Amino acid sequence: LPAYNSDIQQALKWLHNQAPGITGLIQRKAQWYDRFSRQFWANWERDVFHLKTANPFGLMVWCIILGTPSKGFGLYPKNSSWAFGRLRQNFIYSGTQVPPPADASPGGNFYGGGNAEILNLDEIRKVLQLRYVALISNGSIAYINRMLRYIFNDDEPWDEATGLYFYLMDSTGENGPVENLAVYRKDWEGMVLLSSSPRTNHVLTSTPASDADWPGVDPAASGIPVTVETASATAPDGSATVCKLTKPAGSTAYVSAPIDGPLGSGSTVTFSFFAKAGSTRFIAIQSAADFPSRADAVFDLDSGNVISDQMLDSSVVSARMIRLENGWWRCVLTTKTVSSSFRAAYVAPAETNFSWIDSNSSAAIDVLIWGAQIELGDTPTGYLKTTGAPVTITDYVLQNAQTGTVKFTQPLPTGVEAYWTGDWKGGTAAEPARFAVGNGTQDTFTLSDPAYIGLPTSGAFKLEYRVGPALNLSPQLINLMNDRAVGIMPTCAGCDVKVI
Amino acid sequence: ARSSVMRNEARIANTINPNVSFGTFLDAICALMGIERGSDLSTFGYGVQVTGRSQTRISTGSRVQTPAGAIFTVMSDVTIPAGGVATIDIKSQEYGNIPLPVGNLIIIDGTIGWSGAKVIASTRVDPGSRQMSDAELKNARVNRLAIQGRNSTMAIKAYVSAVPNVTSVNVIENNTGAVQVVNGVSFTLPYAVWVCVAGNPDKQAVADALWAAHNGGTPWDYGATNNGVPVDGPNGVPVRDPASGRKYVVKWTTPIMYDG
Amino acid sequence: VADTADVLSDVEAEFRAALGANINLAASTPQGSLVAAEAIARSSVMRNEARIANTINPNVSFGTFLDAICALMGIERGSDLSTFGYGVQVTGRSQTRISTGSRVQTPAGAIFTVMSDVTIPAGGVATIDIKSQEYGNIPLPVGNLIIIDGTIGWSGAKVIASTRVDPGSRQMSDAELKNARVNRLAIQGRNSTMAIKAYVSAVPNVTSVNVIENNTGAVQVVNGVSFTLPYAVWVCVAGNPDKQAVADALWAAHNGGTPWDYGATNNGVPVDGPNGVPVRDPASGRKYVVKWTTPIMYDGYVNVTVQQGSSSVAPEAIQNAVVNYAQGKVEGEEGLVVGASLSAFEVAGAIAREIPGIYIKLCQVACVAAGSPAPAPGDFTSEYVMSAFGQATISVGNVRVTFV
Amino acid sequence: REIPGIYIKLCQVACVAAGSPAPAPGDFTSEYVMSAFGQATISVGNVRVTFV
Amino acid sequence: KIPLTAVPNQAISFNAGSSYWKIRLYQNMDMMNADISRDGVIVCHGVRCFGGIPLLQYSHQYRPDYGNFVFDRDADWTLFGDGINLFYLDGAEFAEYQALAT
Numbered sequence A: 001l002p003a004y005n006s007d008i009q010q011a012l013k014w015l016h017n018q019a020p021g022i023t024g025l026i027q028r029k030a031q032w033y034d035r036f037s038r039q040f041w042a043n044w045e046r047d048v049f050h051l052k053t054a055n056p057f058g059l060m061v062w063c064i065i066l067g068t069p070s071k072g073f074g075l076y077p078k079n080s081s082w083a084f085g086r087l088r089q090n091f092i093y094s095g096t097q098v099p100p101p102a103d104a105s106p107g108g109n110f111y112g113g114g115n116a117e118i119l120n121l122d123e124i125r126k127v128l129q130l131r132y133v134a135l136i137s138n139g140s141i142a143y144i145n146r147m148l149r150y151i152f153n154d155d156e157p158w159d160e161a162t163g164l165y166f167y168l169m170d171s172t173g174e175n176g177p178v179e180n181l182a183v184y185r186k187d188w189e190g191m192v193l194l195s196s197s198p199r200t201n202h203v204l205t206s207t208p209a210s211d212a213d214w215p216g217v218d219p220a221a222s223g224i225p226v227t228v229e230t231a232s233a234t235a236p237d238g239s240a241t242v243c244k245l246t247k248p249a250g251s252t253a254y255v256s257a258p259i260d261g262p263l264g265s266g267s268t269v270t271f272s273f274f275a276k277a278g279s280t281r282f283i284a285i286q287s288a289a290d291f292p293s294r295a296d297a298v299f300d301l302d303s304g305n306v307i308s309d310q311m312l313d314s315s316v317v318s319a320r321m322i323r324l325e326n327g328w329w330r331c332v333l334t335t336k337t338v339s340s341s342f343r344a345a346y347v348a349p350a351e352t353n354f355s356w357i358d359s360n361s362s363a364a365i366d367v368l369i370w371g372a373q374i375e376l377g378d379t380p381t382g383y384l385k386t387t388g389a390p391v392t393i394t395d396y397v398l399q400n401a402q403t404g405t406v407k408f409t410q411p412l413p414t415g416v417e418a419y420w421t422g423d424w425k426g427g428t429a430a431e432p433a434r435f436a437v438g439n440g441t442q443d444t445f446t447l448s449d450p451a452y453i454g455l456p457t458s459g460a461f462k463l464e465y466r467v468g469p470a471l472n473l474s475p476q477l478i479n480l481m482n483d484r485a486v487g488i489m490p491t492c493a494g495c496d497v498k499v500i
Numbered sequence B: 001a002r003s004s005v006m007r008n009e010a011r012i013a014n015t016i017n018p019n020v021s022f023g024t025f026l027d028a029i030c031a032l033m034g035i036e037r038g039s040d041l042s043t044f045g046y047g048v049q050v051t052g053r054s055q056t057r058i059s060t061g062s063r064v065q066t067p068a069g070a071i072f073t074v075m076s077d078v079t080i081p082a083g084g085v086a087t088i089d090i091k092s093q094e095y096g097n098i099p100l101p102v103g104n105l106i107i108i109d110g111t112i113g114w115s116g117a118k119v120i121a122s123t124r125v126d127p128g129s130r131q132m133s134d135a136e137l138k139n140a141r142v143n144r145l146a147i148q149g150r151n152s153t154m155a156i157k158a159y160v161s162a163v164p165n166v167t168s169v170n171v172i173e174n175n176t177g178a179v180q181v182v183n184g185v186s187f188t189l190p191y192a193v194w195v196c197v198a199g200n201p202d203k204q205a206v207a208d209a210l211w212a213a214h215n216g217g218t219p220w221d222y223g224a225t226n227n228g229v230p231v232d233g234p235n236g237v238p239v240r241d242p243a244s245g246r247k248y249v250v251k252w253t254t255p256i257m258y259d260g
Numbered sequence C: 001v002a003d004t005a006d007v008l009s010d011v012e013a014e015f016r017a018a019l020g021a022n023i024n025l026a027a028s029t030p031q032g033s034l035v036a037a038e039a040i041a042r043s044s045v046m047r048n049e050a051r052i053a054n055t056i057n058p059n060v061s062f063g064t065f066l067d068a069i070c071a072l073m074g075i076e077r078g079s080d081l082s083t084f085g086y087g088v089q090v091t092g093r094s095q096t097r098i099s100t101g102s103r104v105q106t107p108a109g110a111i112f113t114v115m116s117d118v119t120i121p122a123g124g125v126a127t128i129d130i131k132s133q134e135y136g137n138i139p140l141p142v143g144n145l146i147i148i149d150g151t152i153g154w155s156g157a158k159v160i161a162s163t164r165v166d167p168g169s170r171q172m173s174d175a176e177l178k179n180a181r182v183n184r185l186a187i188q189g190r191n192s193t194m195a196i197k198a199y200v201s202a203v204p205n206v207t208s209v210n211v212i213e214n215n216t217g218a219v220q221v222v223n224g225v226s227f228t229l230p231y232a233v234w235v236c237v238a239g240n241p242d243k244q245a246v247a248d249a250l251w252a253a254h255n256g257g258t259p260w261d262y263g264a265t266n267n268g269v270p271v272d273g274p275n276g277v278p279v280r281d282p283a284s285g286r287k288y289v290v291k292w293t294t295p296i297m298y299d300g301y302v303n304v305t306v307q308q309g310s311s312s313v314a315p316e317a318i319q320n321a322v323v324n325y326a327q328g329k330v331e332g333e334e335g336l337v338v339g340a341s342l343s344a345f346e347v348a349g350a351i352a353r354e355i356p357g358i359y360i361k362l363c364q365v366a367c368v369a370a371g372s373p374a375p376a377p378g379d380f381t382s383e384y385v386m387s388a389f390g391q392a393t394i395s396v397g398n399v400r401v402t403f404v
Numbered sequence D: 001r002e003i004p005g006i007y008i009k010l011c012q013v014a015c016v017a018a019g020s021p022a023p024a025p026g027d028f029t030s031e032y033v034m035s036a037f038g039q040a041t042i043s044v045g046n047v048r049v050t051f052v
Numbered sequence E: 001k002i003p004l005t006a007v008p009n010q011a012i013s014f015n016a017g018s019s020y021w022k023i024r025l026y027q028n029m030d031m032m033n034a035d036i037s038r039d040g041v042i043v044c045h046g047v048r049c050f051g052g053i054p055l056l057q058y059s060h061q062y063r064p065d066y067g068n069f070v071f072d073r074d075a076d077w078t079l080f081g082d083g084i085n086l087f088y089l090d091g092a093e094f095a096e097y098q099a100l101a102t
Helices: A023-038 A039-048 A056-068 A122-138 A140-153 A475-481 B003-011 B026-029 B135-149 B151-164 B201-211 C009-018 C032-051 C064-068 C174-178 C193-201 C244-251 C316-327 C344-349 E091-101
Strands: A179-186 A197-199 A227-230 A244-246 A255-258 A267-275 A281-286 A295-302 A307-309 A316-318 A320-325 A328-335 A345-349 A363-367 A375-376 A391-393 A397-400 A405-408 A417-424 A444-445 B046-051 B062-064 B070-072 B087-090 B115-118 B166-173 B191-197 C088-090 C112-113 C130-132 C156-157 C206-208 C211-213 C231-233 C303-304 C361-367 C399-402 E008-016 E018-029 E034-037 E039-046 E068-071 E087-088
Touching: A023 A039, A023 C009, A023 C032, A039 E008, A056 A320, A122 A140, A122 A475, A179 E018, A267 A363, A281 A328, A281 B087, A295 A328, A320 B151, A328 C231, A345 A363, A391 C193, A405 B151, B003 C032, B026 B135, B115 C032, B151 B166, B151 B191, B191 B201, C009 C032, C064 C174, C193 C211, C193 C231, C193 C244, C231 C361, C303 C316, C303 C344, C316 C344, C316 C399, E068 E091
Parallel strands: C303 C399
Antiparallel strands: A179 A417, A197 A375, A227 A244, A244 A363, A255 A345, A267 A328, A267 A375, A281 A295, A281 A345, A295 A307, A316 A328, A320 A328, A397 A405, A405 A444, B046 B115, B062 B070, B070 B087, B166 B191, C088 C156, C112 C130, C211 C231, C303 C361, E008 E018, E018 E034, E034 E039, E068 E087
16 A cells, blocks of 8 residues: 655755756666666567567567467568668669569568468467467357457457358258348338238328317417318328418417327337428427326427427337438337326427427417327338228238248339348348339239358368458468468367368 | 666566456456456436526536436536527446436536436436456456366256256267167267256247357257157257357257156 | 667766766776776666566476466476375284385385284285385385384285375476477367367376377378277376276367277277276266277387597486486477387487587487397387387386497 | 477488589488598588478 | 564464464565465465465465465555454365365
8 A cells, every 4th residue: 555666866865956967877877777677668568468469579479378380470571581671772673674563562572482471460460369269269159259259350240241250150050931021111201111910000080181180288278279270282292281280379289189099008109290391390299198197209300309308107118200301200209108098199389399298389380290190019110091090001921931922912003112131041131132123013022132141051070161351351361271280270179170 | 776676577577377467467368358448437418407598507517316426517508598408417436327317406506507307318328337357357267267167068067057947957969870878860970958947938048058058060950759859840049149140050859748 | 578788788887977977087997987887787687687587488487487387277297195005014923013114115115104003913914105205106016125124024015906096296397398388278168189188188197198080081191090080099198096087087078989999990009898988977968988098018229329528428327318308308309209200310319418528420229019129230220110009118228338 | 409399300411522513312421431631511501401 | 364463564484284384475566475485495486465366376386285375355564454364274175265266
């Protein structure tokens, strides 16, 4: 605990203020000791610190510690080797006689002869670390793949679209049929998820028609409740059937769509609401439950930020606002409550971003509304027209899994494209890829090929490495680990190793 | 000078032996695996500040929540007439401190400002807090070496016995194309495993435990159409891989229930 | 970082004083001479001793090398004794046999007794033995001598039923530098050939080990003709008092297949026809499959023709040179292990590493199977290529020296 | 002495007068005796090695 | 145990396990350091003192059959005798503890 000084200049005293000589001596001694016994120790610790050891001495010492032959390593491109200097134009092509090659490593041409020489210190460090593992680690696949990730990518997620570097699948296989599929459809409303099990949309009225269509509630009764009417404006679908409703000053009223209840037994509810450009950059919502347990939200139309939301119960799940083109957006909500009394869903506009559904206003503001839907889930699905009753549609069935064919109940319109994701014929499709093109009449389509994996790799005691070109690793090193007498790759007895 | 140089030399007499600490030990332990730094602050976003009009909340204010954790603010921002703005927070101690989702309290107060409130849209950026200083690092190395000391059958036994609600494990290796204990000559060199359980409510976890031990040249396929029941025909569907990997397959069986 | 420069050290202070105080003197007579000289002697001491603590290199190190060893290898060795048991002595009637009654075998026995016994009118009783030293020694098959006697106990009797537990022999840094490159073991399920070799080499009393692996089928470039995917281990052990742990160490580190002499080859020394039978595994598996063989023992013969040299070198000194190289106590040459190519160049060249100054006119070496007569005078060559089935040994009497 | 840890298969020596071209493979012997007024020299490129 | 006192640099000598011991504890910069002598001849020098891990690292030192010393925590000369202790373990107990260490 107690402090220690260990400082040379402690010898200097108040008796020596205007003394140049003795102070000079002591200060120069202190500088000399600092240079030769503290900075040197810091430098040595750094150059033996293997992670950023670039000093060839450190790599050589670690090689001696590990014990691999060192004839395959270009130790230094430094000025010490043959044919490198400041002028160094003597006895070499200086442009009088012959053009010299330019794309070359620093130093002479004859250094690093043979394709077993690797000339960059970074892969020297990588191969030394992998050799340490091999000499000290002998045979599990999970641990070695994790080690490869850590050493090469510095603990970052990977990309299969460039087919990156994995140990192998062994004699073990990948998969048979296609499992855990999801269908992504690109249309006017962008990315949408489809489900084989039918989806229920319990909203009685897809669009408002009049005041009698959706009742409005005002507890204060301070003014006339908000009015609802149908106007004309461009829909994203290709018609003109938008809705208007205005919020007069001194009136605190919200419009409510009559929906059947209860919606379910206290599970996730995927509220939805098309976002249409209006006078005010903010739209409000509400998702009620047993009083008091309501959870609501507000959507920033202009920027695309969820702003106002509260917990009164444990209802809330998440909220995300989705962009569409030409001033239209997709607004959703999700709620999960311990109870199960989902009563009703309300909607009204707002003046400010943090405005509530029940606050008062200052003036008259108007906004556009279309296409509401409510279902049971956590992810929004395709929109379906509702009038007088809920409507339930399932869009596909896996007609054949092993061949990989899916059949559709209705013929997809022209311009409709489809993606897919999951695992199939031994591959991975974590990123959506096209397999269907919409012409207007077809109903049977064929899945495409994922990035593909050499699934079987059959044969006991057989193993080999597979690498991806995105890493830009030197093929010199690829030739280097193919040997066994050097012994720099982890292996088990009786198993043979191939780098590719 | 002489005392200082002698002591500095004697400080690092032995460094490669992992009894050491303070920085050199970080690399001595980084050869296998080891995580350090990990001392950050729980930075926030999307604050809720209800206050007066056309005022500014001073930077580096004080914030407190119900069990008395002290939080500082980051950015100073003006107030709109509505009475709502968003702030940025930071903790007093460099620890992964927990803000209970309960409306805050004020320590340092500016004029016409009150009621630091929670909101669901706020991001909760959870920090690491000096989780491995020097000694739990050594215990991590010890635990790693313990895991690594076990061999194939022993590792499988330990891993499967580790999962909850398992009771027994039986492991055999054929080691030849002939029969040693049971008639498994379906493949020349398999590795058979049987597990008892109180139900296997977590079928995926058992597959993960079995997969965490894998030899890389020895298939797990076992069966003689008469031995213990296999769980599934073609595959036991393990997880793909925790670390930069894809789907692998493992297979295992269970005994036959007998009533005494 | 490897080397330190000290030629420019004196100039450093001889000009530090000049630019510090003034430009005067720095000569050898005045008072500044001693100050400058001491500021250089002390600086050179620090410059040397700051590097010498750096390297750490596995070689060049000493004493601190035990940490670089213990980073990977569990430990080097220990210090135990060659305790015996099941002994017996030839005695008379009602003799109170003494404790520590020293019995000396002809090859430097110096063996005491561990407990005290009283004899019986039958004339034969059992006594226990502990070696008065702490190295690895062996007792001859017959009784040799008794030192402490009551003139009634006639002779100490060595029988076949008795046990022979073997000890270790301390440490040697020059010998640690050798086995360091071999004794390193790995950290998955421990199923690689290098893992097997390192784990087996750490067992006590095991002088050398050889391990080979097939990977292909039919035959392999290394010696062995039989099984398609075998694993051949050819342990050279002085003894296995844990006769099952010499096999349990194999079993724990082993995954694959175990044949005897690759399975079907000839002229080895397998430990037995049937298996080695490990006692049990702690994984509830009664898998008893382990097979290893011992090398075919050999004999050695070394001959040399040396000039009189520069110093009065006794002809008895050159004999001890080659015995250490066979035993591998020199720093750099591993020793006589399986497949050790007994050569006159590797031997007669290395004898000068400890007694230089002599001129070696000629040396030629050869060997024959153990327990067989000496070869012909013309039966000596420069080399003797050894197969991987066995290794040679050198004794003191086999070396003949002529000062021609 | 200079480098242990190495196995030497065969080493053979020869001698010849100064300036003579390279002699044939048969000119090597285990030992070479030299006259009193004779002195031997070895050069860097004179030595040839084989990593058999 | 070892009866210790709060001094920045001290030494202890005693007869433990049928053998004579001599421990010299001194402060070095930050960490504690110790020097161990048995029966008049040195064993190891400048051992860094830490909690739990034993002072003798090497087999030929701590035992053919002898014992070892262990600190429960990182030592601090201002705390000795007060919540910080040093313990000596015989051969059997330390062998058991070493096996448990893994």
